[PDB]
Paper text:
Here we report that human SLC35B1 does not bind nucleotide sugars but indeed executes strict ATP/ADP exchange with uptake kinetics consistent with the import of ATP into crude ER microsomes. We have further determined seven cryogenic electron microscopy structures of human SLC35B1 in complex with an Fv fragment and either bound to an ATP analogue or ADP in all major conformations of the transport cycle. We conclude that SLC35B1 operates by a stepwise ATP translocation mechanism, which is a previously undescribed model for substrate translocation by an SLC transporter.
SLC35B1 structures with and without AMP–PNP addition are mostly equivalent, apart from the extra cryo-EM map density for the nucleotide. Unexpectedly, the ring-shaped map density implied a nucleotide conformation where the terminal γ-phosphate had arched back towards the adenine moiety. However, this is an unusual configuration for the ATP analogue, and the symmetrical map density made it difficult to confidently assign its correct orientation. The map density for AMP–PNP in Q113F was in the same position as in wild-type SLC35B1; however, the improved resolution now enabled its unambiguous assignment and confirmed the toroid shape conformation of the ATP analogue.
Numbering used by the authors: 12 to 40, 46 to 162, 168 to 316
The structure:
Amino acid sequence: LRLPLCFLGVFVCYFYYGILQEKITRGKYQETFTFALTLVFIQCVINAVFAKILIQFFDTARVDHTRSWLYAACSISYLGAMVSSNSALQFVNYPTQVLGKSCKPIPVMLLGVTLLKKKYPLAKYLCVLLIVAGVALFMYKPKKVVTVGYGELLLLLSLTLDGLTGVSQDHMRAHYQTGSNHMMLNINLWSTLLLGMGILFTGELWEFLSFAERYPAIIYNILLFGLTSALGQSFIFMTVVYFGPLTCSIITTTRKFFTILASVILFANPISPMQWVGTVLVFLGLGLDAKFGKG
Ligand SMILES: Nc1ncnc2c1ncn2[C@@H]1O[C@H](COP(=O)(O)OP(=O)(O)NP(=O)(O)O)[C@@H](O)[C@H]1O
């Protein structure tokens, strides 16, 4: 049973996803792409329909034991995190976003330690040193010699909301014995409903066609971005059931490092050497916990 599709499928698709996301966000159209909610709405609905058409061809005996409200709260947290992350690209540069967003464990770790009252032996005190050193050497100058950018605040709030969603997921999985496809399916429906409800009130989507009228070449790319996102979500779901979940961490780390490399190469984003070694340090620490002492 050769399974090369476990690597290629989740690698090439997410690589195209990242390249498209960078293309349509920082594209020098002049009217910058200030709209951050429409694309996440489209992505959510596309991935939801793909989830339905996928579960239709999978096991049916499973019965969703999860209650309604937990999915709703997890959906608000998840959609808020995604919206805040995407809206921040107007200030910061792409490589900084994909690096900062990648340090997911630290928010979850601190939230669990302060709230869940957990314990981790010399693992959340050792790899954290490498992670924080890398982050605080890459984006930061030596001594602020050569108010912080508002995008950093948005990224920090995104990390906080993402940690909240993660802890919520952990609870609904442990104490309620939820599944994998059902969870993502329900949270997607709730998130898209809430996003649409808010959007119609915001008075922007009614005004969003005119922007499309200005540049008719912003429809195919966004559709492809949604399609690849949904395909990648389905592929990662299919992987996680095989070889356990530990492979997912290494897969994502490799994908994000190659995404950094492609971003710096293709789009000519300047980077300094002393800065450049910053990303490798944080990436090495990231996933090292998964390889040794998962936590
Ligand atoms: N059991 C799972 N394992 C991995 N990813 C999952 C799982 N369940 C849901 N996902 C989603 O799969 C995506 C993984 O991509 P990513 O945004 O990089 O998260 P990640 O934690 O950094 N990578 P990963 O360790 O595989 O979850 C996210 O959108 C997760 O919400």
